[PDB]
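Key idea: predict the complex, not the pieces.
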Amino acid sequence: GVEGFNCYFPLQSYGFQPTNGVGYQPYRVVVLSFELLHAPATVCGPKK
Amino acid sequence: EFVFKNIDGYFKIYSKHTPINLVRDLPQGFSALEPLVDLPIGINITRFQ
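Result:
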């Protein structure tokens, strides 16, 4: 459990600051996983 | 009153509320039961309580 010559911590802490430039910013990612079972569809916009 | 039906992958549960006053048995009257909820759920319920 101690970092050595061939051992390092897998969980590098994120160094998010308000001013860090493009690329190092925190990026909120939402993955919506939709399933299409033979039951009717429930969540979407109304029909026009 | 409840009617538990399951036809064609659809669970139909009707509702009826009645003020009742009879002593022992089912009354001599008529009542339809109106749908409150329809549920398109395929379940093979085997026990209840």
